[PDB]
Amino acid sequence: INIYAGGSAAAAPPAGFRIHRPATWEESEEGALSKATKYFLLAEMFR
Amino acid sequence: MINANPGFWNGPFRYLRWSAHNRPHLFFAFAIGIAGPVAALTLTPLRRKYLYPDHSPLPQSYPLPQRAREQLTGFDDE
Description:
- The structure is cut from a larger assembly and holds chains A and B.
- By secondary structure, chain A is an all-alpha fold.
- Chain A contains two helices and no strands.
- Helix content of chain B is 49%, strand content 0%.
- Chain B is rod-shaped and about 100 Å long.
- The A-B interface holds A 22, 24-25, 28, 32-33, 35-36, 39-40 and B 2-3, 17-18, 20-22, 24-25, 28.
- Chain B: Keywords: Membrane, Transmembrane, Transmembrane helix.
């Protein structure tokens, strides 16, 4: 169907290869006090 | 970069949210340190009026009376 110039249908990138974006502090679905508590009481460490 | 500073004068509340999210180790230190002097200023008179008053001071030394001497007796010699 398609003709390729120095390329191929295999070397064409995967459909979703482009990672979405880094999230910022905004667009964080975890309140500041929650991750603050996990920051100051060392949760994963106790686990 | 991803989470740089938006500036205290370009939205205080937005700066406070950024700091609680990215620099808790300062934010909660400031909150601790401000919560003492401020509460001491504000809550103390309430506690003095409603919960209980301020205690009466301790002697600290012999309480020498502010008067002149009186002639007594009893317990004399003989």
